[PDB]
Each structure stands twice: as C-alpha cells, then as structure tokens.
Amino acid sequence: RHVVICGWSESTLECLRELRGSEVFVLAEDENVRKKVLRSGANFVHGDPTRVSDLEKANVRGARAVIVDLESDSETIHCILGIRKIDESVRIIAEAERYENIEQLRMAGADQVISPFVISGRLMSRSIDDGYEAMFVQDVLAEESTRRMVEVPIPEGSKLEGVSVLDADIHDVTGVIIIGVGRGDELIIDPPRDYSFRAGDIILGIGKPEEIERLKNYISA
Amino acid sequence: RHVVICGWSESTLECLRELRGSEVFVLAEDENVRKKVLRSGANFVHGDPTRVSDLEKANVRGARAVIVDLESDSETIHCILGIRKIDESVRIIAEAERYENIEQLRMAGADQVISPFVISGRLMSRSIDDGYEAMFVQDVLAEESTRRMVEVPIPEGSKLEGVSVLDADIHDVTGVIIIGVGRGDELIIDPPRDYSFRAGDIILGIGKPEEIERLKNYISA
Amino acid sequence: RHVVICGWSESTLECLRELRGSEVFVLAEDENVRKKVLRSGANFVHGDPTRVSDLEKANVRGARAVIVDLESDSETIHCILGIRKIDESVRIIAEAERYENIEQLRMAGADQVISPFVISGRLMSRSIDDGYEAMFVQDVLAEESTRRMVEVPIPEGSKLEGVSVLDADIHDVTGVIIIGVGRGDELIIDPPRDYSFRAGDIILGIGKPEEIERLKNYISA
Amino acid sequence: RHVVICGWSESTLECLRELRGSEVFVLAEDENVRKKVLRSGANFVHGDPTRVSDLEKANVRGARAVIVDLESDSETIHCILGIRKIDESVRIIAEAERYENIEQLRMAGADQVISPFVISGRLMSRSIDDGYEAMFVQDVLAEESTRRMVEVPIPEGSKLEGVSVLDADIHDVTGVIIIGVGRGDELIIDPPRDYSFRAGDIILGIGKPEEIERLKNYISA
Amino acid sequence: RHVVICGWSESTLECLRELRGSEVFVLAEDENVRKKVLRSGANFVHGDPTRVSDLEKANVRGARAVIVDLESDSETIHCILGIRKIDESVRIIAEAERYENIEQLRMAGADQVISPFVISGRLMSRSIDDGYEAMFVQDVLAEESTRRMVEVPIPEGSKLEGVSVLDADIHDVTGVIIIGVGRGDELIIDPPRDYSFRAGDIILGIGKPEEIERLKNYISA
Amino acid sequence: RHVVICGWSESTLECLRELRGSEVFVLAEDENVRKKVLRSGANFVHGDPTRVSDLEKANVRGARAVIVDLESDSETIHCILGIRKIDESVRIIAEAERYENIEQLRMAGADQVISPFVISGRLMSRSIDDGYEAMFVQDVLAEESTRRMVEVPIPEGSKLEGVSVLDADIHDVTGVIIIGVGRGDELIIDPPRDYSFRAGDIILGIGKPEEIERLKNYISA
Amino acid sequence: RHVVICGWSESTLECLRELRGSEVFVLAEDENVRKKVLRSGANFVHGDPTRVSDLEKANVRGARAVIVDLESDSETIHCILGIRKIDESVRIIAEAERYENIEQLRMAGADQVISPFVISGRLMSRSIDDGYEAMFVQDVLAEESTRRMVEVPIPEGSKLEGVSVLDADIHDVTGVIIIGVGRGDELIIDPPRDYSFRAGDIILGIGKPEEIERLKNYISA
Amino acid sequence: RHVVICGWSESTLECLRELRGSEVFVLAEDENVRKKVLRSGANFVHGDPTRVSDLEKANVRGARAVIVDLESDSETIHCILGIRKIDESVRIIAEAERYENIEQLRMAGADQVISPFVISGRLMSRSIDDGYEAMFVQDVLAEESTRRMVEVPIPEGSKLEGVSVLDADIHDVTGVIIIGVGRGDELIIDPPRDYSFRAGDIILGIGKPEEIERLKNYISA
C-alpha cells in the first residue's frame, strides 16, 4: 500500500514534507514536473490523470490513498470519477478551488475535501478590520509555531473507557482544549457533557507539545 | 475608507462575497480580469501592482486595507514593499504560496499573512489515515455548515468586564467554546484560568448561530 | 423557451443548420468564438460554462434544452453537473470524446450522449477491407443524400391505434424500413411481430422523402 | 499489406482498438504523440503528412489502406492529394470535419469518408425534442450494447445463390433486419423484392450476436 | 468587378503597389492583418479563406480575379478548391511554396501559379560560383531598373498583321528582344522564323522604356 | 571550401537539391530545424546567426559561399554584417523580403540579392489581366520544363575569341537566345551588334537542352 | 524640432522624465505600449519601426533627435538604417545591447551609442572584489546623490577665453574636477596643461550643485 | 570559493569576460539558458533562484559573491532576500531595472546595485542636444578604448603612506585623474587637499594604461 498524487502544486509539495520516507507516485502530464517531483524524493509517473488507463498505470487500485489536485475543478472531478470506476474502496483526498464544486467533488466520490481558496478568501474579508481568527488559523493550522491540533485515539482498554466528558475533565487535567470526538466518519464538535467515550474514539483538540504529551499518557491504562 | 485588491484569484473572488456593496478597487495588469471583476460588482484599476505609480493610481494611501494576492510570492512581496513606501499605516493582508516566504511577507510589511497551500498540503498528508482535523477545518472554516468561528468584542461597560475566565463560565453559559482572546495585535489562545477581561477585548470561539446570539446578549446592557 | 449551447465546435455549428431561425444562445469563454457565433445568426454569451453563476447567466433554467460540447470530457462533465444543480428537469444533450466517458456523461445527468469520435474510429478500422457499413453511415446518417432516418409519432386517433406490427405491414405499405418503436425513454429495436401500437409511440425508420410522406398519411385521421 | 495512419486523434486511437495485432504506421509531426502511439503498439514515423517525401517514408506505397485524420480539412485534403501522387490504388479512408469539404475529400481521392462532426451536429439538433434516433446510433454504431451492424458475404456455392429477396425471407428466418446489399462499390439500400442474390454480394444488416450467427449458417454449405 | 486577395504576405503588399487605385478586398482571419491592409488603402474582410461561406462573403463570384497566398500550401489549395466551387470562371492567381504543389495548385483550379521559393532556392545554389542569371532576375524581374519585360498586344488592323517573325525584324527595328508570343492560353517561347503574327497575339519580350514605346508605335494604326 | 547557410526556409531546402552531396552547414537557433536539416543530408550548427561568435563557430571565414535567409530583413542584414566583419572577401548570397531593404543588404555587404517576394508581388498584379510573363517565369525560371537560362563561359582560345556579336550570329547557329554577356562584375544585357567576345566572358541566355549543348560545342576547341 | 523615440523600455521611459514638456513621438509595434506612453504624456504612433513608411509616419524627417532602443540590435541597426534613408542630418541616439554591435550601430549611422548592458556586466565582474568604481557610477551617473556630471559651455566674451588649463586652475577655483573638453565632435579627456580655451568649448566635469554653480559664474561676463 | 549568477542576460555574459577561466555557476529556470551558458565556458545549475532550496543547491553559502539579474525587479528582490536568509555575509551584486527599486534592492540586502536602464535613459535625454557626457560614458565606462576607470590599493609600506593629496601630486606625477578614495565601504569623491593616505585605501582614477602602470609603481616598496 502506497500513495498516489494526481497533479502538482505547492500544496502537493507541502504534502511531501510528511510523506518523504514513504513511496509516493506523482501522476502528471507535464514533463517539467519530472524535475520537481524528483527534487522532493518522490516517484514520477508520466500520464494524463483524467484518463482511466493512466490512473491504473500508477497503481491506483490497492493504493493506500489518492490525493487529487489538478489545475481546474473540472479536471479534479473527472479524475476522481476515474478512480471510483477503478476502485471504490481507496481513500480519496481532493482539493477544491471553487466553492460551487465542494459538493461535486464529494458526489464524484472524494472521501475528504480541502477548500484552501474558500478559507483564504473568507479570512481575507473578515481580517480587514481585526482578524484575530486569521492569526489563529495562521499560527495553529499553518505554522504550528506554539500550538498544534491533534487526533489522538483512545486505545483498547483505555483509562477513559466508559468515562463521560464531564468526568474526564480533559481540558483541566491535560491542558488540551477538546474540540470534538470522532467516530467512524463522523465528528461531533463540542460533545454533549455526558457523552461516553469508547475504545476507537478520536479526540480532536488544540494544544502545545507538552499538553499533547500529557494527553497521550492520560489515555492508556 | 475603501479596499484595494492587488491581483485576482478565486481567493479574491471568494473575498468579495463579504464586501459586495462596498467600494472595492481591484488592481491588476491583465485585461481579461476587468471582465470578472465587473461580474462581481467591484471597480477595476488597470496597472502593474508592483509599480509604485500604479499603486497610487489605485488609491492605496488612506485606504481602509489592501489585500495582496499576486501570481508568485516574488510579486506579492514586491507589491507589499511598494505599498509600505506609499503608506506605512494602511492595513495589509497578503496570501503566501511557499512556506519559506511567510517570513518574507512579514518583513516586507504585511500585517496578516494567509498560507492556504501550507494548510492544504499539511491537511492532505495527515488525512491519509484519518483526518478528522481535515473535516473540522472543512465544516467550520470553509463551509460553516452548522458552526462558525466568531470575533465578538467586549463592549464598554460590559457585564463581563473585570471578570475572570473561570468566573465568566462562557462555555457553560452560552454553548460557545472559547479558543482565545485578542488584545491589541495579540491573540492569547487558551487564556489563563484567572485572566481578567477588559472592555475592547475580542472573544474568539466556535459556535452555532444561536450559541453566538446568547453570547452577544451575555456581554452588553 | 430557447436553446443553450455550451462551447463551440463544428458539431455545434452543424447543429444550427436545424435551429437557424430560433433563439440559440452560445455560452463560451473564448472571445474569438463571438465572431463565428454571430456569423451563424446566434446569440453569444461570454462566460465560463463550468461556472454555475455563468450557466444561470445564460438562462439555463427553464430553457428548451442545453447542448454541451466543450474542449474536453473533463469540462463537458463538469458543465453537465453544474446545469443539473441549476435545473434537474432541463434536457441535456452532450458530446463525449472518449469511450470511457460516455457513461460518466450519463451519470452526470445528460439525457442523451453522442460519441462521434468512437463511431468514427470504430468505423475506420472496419472499412479497411470493405465497409458498406461506412457508406451506409455516410450516405444516410451524414449526407442524407437519398434516404433518411425518421422519428414519426403515432398521434391520437391514429389509423394504427392498437394495430399489431405484422397487421400494420408498414414496410410493404409505405416503403419505410421500421427499425424500432420508441415509448417514453425506451427504444425497442426490431420489435416483436405481435407488438401493438399506441398513441404516443415513435416510429424509427429508414426511408426516401416520398416513402416518409407516405408514412405520415397512413398514420393519422 | 499494412496500415498507415496520418494524424493522431481520439478517432485514430479508437481505430487501433480493432487493429491491435497488425502492422500500423502512425505519421504525425507532433512529438508528444510518439508516447501514446508506442503504448498503443504501433510504429511511429515523425514527420509532415502533407509532404510527399514523409508520406513515402511512412510506407504509404502498397499499404493495405491509409487512414487520414489531420487537424483541419485543409491538411487532410492536401494529405490525400499527396498519397494519390505516390499510389493511386491504396484504399484511402479519410475523416471530414466540415460538411462543405466532404465533396472535396472524394475529389481529392478518398475512397470512403467519415463525417463524425456532421452526424453529431445533426443528432444534437434532432434530439432536442425526442431523439430515439440518437440512442439507436449510440447503441448500435458506438456501444454495440445489444445489437451490432453486420457485413456478411455470400460465399461461393451458397444456399441463397440465385434466390430472390422475398424468397430468401431473411428477417423472419434469422432475426436480422436487412438494410442493404453491396455489389462492387455501390450499396442498394432496401433492395427490390425480386432482387436476385449472387455469390459475392454483401449483406448489410442489424442484429444481435445470435441472429448474426444464424445468418452465417443460413448461407453456406 | 474588383480584386479579392486571400491571405497576406509581403507579396500581397507588393501586389497592391499597382492596384492601389482599385477596389481590393483582402480576406484574412488574423485581426493584426486589418491594420496593415487599411494602411495600403485596401478593404479588409474578416473571415476564414478556406471556408466557402467566408469566400462567398468576400464577393469571390463576379470578382475580376482572385489572388490566393495563404500560410501553407495545404490552405492555398483548399482555398482554390472553394473558389472553384463558387465560380468555375473566375481568374485565379496562386502562390506556390513547395515544388511538390505546383501541380496541385493547377489541379485544384489555379490559372497561374507563382513559385517564388522554388525560383529563389534554385537561384541560390546556382549563384554560388557565378550567377549572372541571378543579377538578370534581380534587375529585370524584381527592380526593373533600366529594362523590364513587356506584354504588348497586336491591335486589330496592325501593320504587323500577317507579317512573319523574320520579316517583322522586331529586335532590329525596335530594340525589344522577343522572348515569345502568346495566343489564347498558349505561349510560344522563341517563335520559329516563319511564324505569322495575328491581331490579338501578345508579344512578350525584354526592353528599355524607349524600346517599348518604339514597339507600341511600330504595330498599330 | 563548403557552403554555410544561415536560416532555413523552403528556399534553402530547394537550394540544397543542387548541392546535396556537398558539405553544407546550416546555422540556425531553432531546435525543430535540426530535424529537417538532417532530413536533407545537410549539417546542423546550433547558434544565433546574428551573433558573430556563432558565425565564426560555423566556419564562415574561408568558406566557398554563405547563403543568408533569416526570418526578417532586420536579421538578414545583421547577419551579413557579421560575416563581412569576419571576412570581407567571402561570397554572400542573400534573400530580401521587403523592397526597401534590397539596398540595405547590398550596403551591408551582400554580393548577390534575391528578392522573391518583390518578384512574386509584381507578377501578381501584372497577371490579373494577362500575364504571359507570369507563365514564362514559371516555366523557365521555376520548373525549367523544356527550356532554361544558361551561363556558358568562353574558353581560352575559343572559336569566338575576338569575334563580334553580329559575326558570331549565336542565335541562328545555336538556337539559344542571348540575354546578356558577363564580364568581371558587369552584366551587359542585350550587347551591341559590334561587342567583341573575349576568353572569360559569360554568355547568358535561354535555351533548350540541345540548343545549350550546341553552344558549348560552338565555342571551344 | 521635436523628439522621436523608437521602441519602449524602462530606458525610454526614464528618458521622458527629463523630456516631459516637449513634443515626443513614440513609435512601437506593440499595442499595449499606448496606455503607458500617454500616461507619460507623449504622442504614440502604432507601427513597425524597422519600416521606412512607418518611420516617416512618426515624423523622423527633420526631428530634433531620434532615440532608438528596440528589442534586439538586429532591429535597432535596421531601424537606424531606415532613419538614415529619411534624414541623414537628424541626431540619432541608439542603445546597444551586444558589444559586437556597438561598431554596427555607428556604421549604420547612429550619432551617439549607449551601452548599458556592457557597462553593467563590466561593473558586475569588477565589484566581486571591491567595486568602489561601481558606487561612483551609481552615485554620479545614476542617482546623482551629492554629485553629478556637467557640460557647461564657454560663452562668447568669456573670462576664460584664451586662458590656459594651468592658469585657469579650475578645480581649485570652483571644486569641479575637470574631466574633459569638447571641441566639434570630439572630447579630449585630461587635456595638456597648456591647452588654451575658446568660446564654445564645452567643459566636462564632476561636481556638487554649489561647485557647479560657481563654474557658470567663473566663465561669463 | 566561486561565483554564483542568478538569471541570464547580455549583462551576465559581459560579466564572464573577466571571470572566463574561473568557476562560475549560473542558476536559471529556463532550459534554453543551458546551451548559452555552456557556450560561455560556465557551469549551469538548473533551478528556481527565488526558491531558497534551489539557491542552497547552487552553493550560495560561502561563495565568493552572488550576482543577481533576473527577468524583473520582483524576482531580483525575492532572490536577494532568499540569499540573505541563507548567508548574510556573502557579497551580493544585483542589477536594478526600475529607479524605484534601487532603494529596495539594498533594503533586501544587496551590497552593490547597478542600474543600467536608469543610466541609459538619463544619458538619452541629456544627449539630445550635445552630450559629451554620453561619449565619456561610452568610451571610458563602456568601451575603454583609450582610457579606463581604475581601483588601485595602497599596499602596506607604500611610498604614499601618510602623505596628503596635495603633497602626493598624483595627477602631475603619473597622469591619472584622481576621482575618489575608498576606505571600508565608503568612497570620498574629490577628497580634501590635506587628506592623508593609509595602507588599505583604494584610489579611484581615470588613466591611460601607461598612466595607470605609472601609478602602480609610484605606490609601492
């Protein structure tokens, strides 16, 4: 199981910061891309990511996950549609440029959508006056200068097994703010006070390196 | 006061959903852009955002804010530098493509920096396995489908003035998670338990429309 | 109610041979297209037919039909999807370039697809030796030099109402070779001999101009 | 005896679906085309198909057939002219974009013309209202989902030799709709009832795999 | 009756030095050509000279003559074919780039071919050693600096009517070297000594302007 | 000694039909040109013909002749200027686009100018009415179908040495029309009746292959 | 007497900073240049500066001076040649890119040559080590921070008329470093100690605005 | 230690006249640059000199100097900033196009700036009338035909150590016109009469080669 990236932008370069060590195949039609992809220590596959026979050429079936990021949403959607006809199980992460098309990328079959231009534009217009939101996003989601965001799983037979959010007191015990809990494909933001934790649940929250460290300790029993 | 936009992408289009009805002047060299900018109900100024004389031609001095989003960070930086030479007061929001260049846009004189490709790429790599963080960002920062992030100010003569975060009990009172407090240019994420609120402080948090309303009530009168 | 054409090619031009006298609106982004479109006696709408806001600008909702034929299947698919989110009733006729994408075009929401490239290329390989098929296609489906394909509806109170296909004996009476009968969205090619006609049925036949005239009379009053 | 293809499009790619296994020379001047051609399993000769020296380089002389599909009818007509100047015998199959030029493709020398854009354009305009015709052509000339078009010869000493059309009663005996009969270079569509079959005639008809198979038996032995 | 020019090169600008005073319509697709064509006191028609409807648009039927000079031979031919399809009578002067195609221009329907590239290439290799031929062509066919080639008609009731070439003694009486004599469509280069002149014959030969005036006088009245 | 060719048109390719078997080097900057240049059996030198160091690179000093035919007159002139700067003796044959620049190539330092565009334009305007001149240029200077122009040298101790033009009676003895006589750098078109031939003079005239052969014999031995 | 400028660059723009107030015609091929030229307050003529007819359209004849700065030395040379055909008197100032062509620009007819790329590259290579030379040129010929270069003429009835270099002792009297002396068309840098001044001689020297001011005083009255 | 050059122009070509034989590495993104750079005897690094990772790859750290001259002031500035973030010691020589940006190039960290466009344009306006200045610049800074600009160090134990400019009398002794004295980073143009020389001072003068040679000897041992 390996990672396939369709298209190449700064996004997919930043993506290879955390996959550089894993076998990554980049599928793009432009030749000039070969140089850049090999600069990042990834495999390059020359072909058209909108063509079904070329998606297979890059082992899309049986692959760990596919990241789609082409030059228009038109191409991005069409590429997704191709993957779903090749393998309906493989995880698809795709970038959406236009807001209109977030819905389309999902209906094409993308598992998770990323809308960086929708965010950017929204953060711009809000930050005209103040935009403390903007510098939050910049410092937590972009730079992670002091704080980071974490997905921590509750392991089987955890200390928090069957413990309500109220009793768990996660924020004061560990320092991490609890944003929400994830089960399956579903995230419950700001969970009810008496929600009960299970093994396999995902805790999502903001915290510094140490507060995160305390969190991981606080969970295994 | 009016808003000047340098360059044109989907970001700046998405940006105009919120200023649509305000005096917005878009400065770009490409002729094809006039067509789209007039489609969005904004003014068009034909010039080179990197040339100082064209920046003045677009009323950058004494403008409310300038948003900089050009085709490369090279240009973005060069544009900012031109603005800082016309007016060192005017608020500058700029989007950075490469990570290495976030530091540079600040040194050039940008007030708030946005890094959509840094976020996008980082979200991509971590969402290969799970990515509940990814769908959080998607549903609150991008789509605002159920929840939203808010900046509410503490009015002069507030009910919460001189009251600590522990005493304020804002989470249990209103439903809104308090992420941080802004004073001046400084955002304090997860503020000290005994931190004292002042008039003019900005509350940054996540909430549903109703939970937001209860917060607005909870401050004034 | 009018016809909207997304994109411009020789197909969409040949299409105006039969609507030449109707309000046809052509939506395309390339400026060069205007000149050609106005030489055809057609309305031109400048815009991106993959952008929902531009499709609506072209009065796609409540139009007679939308013809989609863009530079790539990628865009053609995307366009269809956008139309389908503006109006799910409007009839969509779309041209597929690649074979793999005929079924993508239907699953996007096009009511009728055409694969001129697939027909053409398949016909090529088959005409290397003989190819009486190719000259059938050319002389009947392209030039209509002597014979034509016809769709003739069986009107209310028709002479043929409730008459069996063998009993009707249309080929020997009229001259027209009956290929199939259409009801609703379903075409029964070579219908069983004991099939009954109803008012509303469509007869699909090959025939000479006089032979077709003879059919129109044998049906009504 | 081998096949020469001048120009590269989705049509010529679809051609090699049926030619894969035989010796094909593809002549175009774009280099990008080498890649797609060798992964299609054909020989590639880089050069200008409108230039006679390059056509000769591509073994047009004494080829089984030459298929011409260039970017404009200008080039396609010029190409055919060249081929006829090298070899006036070789079967020329050429694709006409514009209607006006179908007449010219023949006058230049092409033995059979295909006009995909003309067919497509006409099917579009017709299918606005109903278009059961479109879905016939789609499901028999393109997809061959249930029915196909056949060209079966009458072999030497066949059961049907010297038998009249009415006497042969082919539709009822076999299930196949007889469209026409080919003698020499001409197709007689809907032949007279008393037409006599000869060894060497070609039957052009519509039928399913079983009906087709029944037809081949019905003639020989 | 008026002159129609397809395409635009330096040739066609030089052609206009002697029609400037007549109505000339240049038919080209390039917008840039408009500026140049109006700088010569010539009319501009915007259109595709290989498309028959654009050819008709520019009054090709009933035009005095059509000059065809397009960007490739492929086109020049296609253009000529279109003109011949509108009017089989109209005089066609066509410029030929490749030698291969001098034949094809004539078969397409050109009344006179000009092959400046062929002439030029031959003069090049020829003039490496000597090329006295080269400076003749330069000084008589290009510059006409002292001499020039003449076409002079023999008027009705001419002093030369019925006089043989020997008896007429033209070179010695007038100074004009006779190259040939034209009747109908036939050009006799170096006419035999006993060739008899007729009213309507064209004398073709080289001469200074005084030698030409001498000939004019020597034939008429 | 060898031929150096700056630039590449159909002119230069035609030029090579007569040198094919000589070491000819084509100096051009374009990569596409390599293909075509090696397709004619010529050598490719990659350089900028207007850059003197690249000019030297291609053995311009001490080369038999240099043929200049670049894409604009600005370039052609420039080139000629470098070659003259590298060597004032070397034979330069140069093609002229605009009439304005025939003077400029000669002053730049070209030995013989060819102006096919000027010739072709004049022949166009001329041939609207008649143009028997046109078909002469076509059949004698371009195609040489039955006649051609010759340059025949008078050998040392020729039978014509010291014989006058009248006494030589060349036309009547040989069949060749004499146009002019070449001495040194000077061409005397239509030489006076009493011009005395010398060993080294060049007879320039039009003739059939047999008429030319007759002349060669008539002069020597 | 007005100024014609051929071609547009930052140079010709920097030029108009000192000319704005006088009649300037700018001749350029590119349309985009119009807006920037009228923003600079000079007349713009659209046309080909390498063509005589267009140069005449731009009023080169009897202009005060013509400045030539086209995109290649090729064009600049051709351009100058054209001007010299129109007016052999007009002062031609031209900019040389390549060093090899400075000699060509003069031989073409340019009165003064400026070689900014040659000065630049030369200053780049020297300054690797020290480069106090680089900062002199920058601070005197470019920025004129504290000092600049002067050309003060010696008027009729001059105090210095007939006085020698040693006796005039110009540096000690005025602070101005005497660089050279202009007589006719020729500058004598660092003249003999006993050189005697004349009215109309031009002094070329380096100085501050006060030092320069004293020199003007020092000469007249 | 070696020299790194970012971007390529005739400036950087002229630069290699003085380092031709030294290890020069040229960093540019355009493939086409490769061939030109290797014709100059320099090394080519393929990369984007605005990307920090690519400046690193070019060994910018600890290089002798870095010369920046890119397509636009935007890119030139970005480059300098990248270098200063890699090494804040390395000497940066950069070329500025626009006047506004000379300010910026230094503020980005360039040790020495050159503005060939500013000089050139300034000289143009100045030289419309006379311009002996321009011919100083041309013949001394550009061509160096008779006289050169020089930087000579006063070595340790110099004859001139601690001698004033009045007492040194360098102009009358050696013939070189003393312009300024350089110490550290500062140039004192036209130094005071009684300025004392020190070991390590740089003398900036204008001299003939013998004049300069005479200075080198007057200065040592």
From Swiss-Prot, chains A, B, C, D, E, F, G, H:
Keywords, ordered alphabetically: Calcium, Cell membrane, Ion channel, Ion transport, Membrane, Metal-binding, Potassium, Potassium transport, Transmembrane, Transmembrane helix, Transport
Binding site for Ca(2+): 69, 95, 97
Keyword match Isomerase: no
A GO term for molecular function: identical protein binding
Any single GO BP term: potassium ion transport
Entry's Gene Ontology cellular component terms: plasma membrane
Keyword Membrane in annotation: yes
Topology in the lipid bilayer: Multi-pass membrane protein
Domain RCK N-terminal: 1-115
Annotated ranges, domain RCK C-terminal: 137-221
Subcellular location(s) of the protein: Cell membrane
Protein purpose: Calcium-gated potassium channel.
Miscellaneous information on this protein: It is not known whether calcium is the physiological ligand. Inhibited by charybdotoxin (CTX), a protein from scorpion venom.
Domain topic, free-text comment: The channel is composed of 4 repeated units, each containing a transmembrane pore part and a gating ring part. The gating ring is composed of eight identical RCK (Regulators of K conductance) domains, in an alternating arrangement of one domain from each of the four subunits and four from the intracellular solution. Two protein interfaces between dimers of RCK domains from the pore-forming subunit and from the intracellular solution hold the ring together. One is called the fixed interface and the other the flexible interface. The flexible interface forms a cleft where calcium binds.
Subunit structure and binding partners: Homotetramer.
Name used for this protein in its record: Calcium-gated potassium channel MthK
Organism: Methanothermobacter thermautotrophicus (strain ATCC 29096 / DSM 1053 / JCM 10044 / NBRC 100330 / Delta H)
Gene name of this polypeptide: mthK
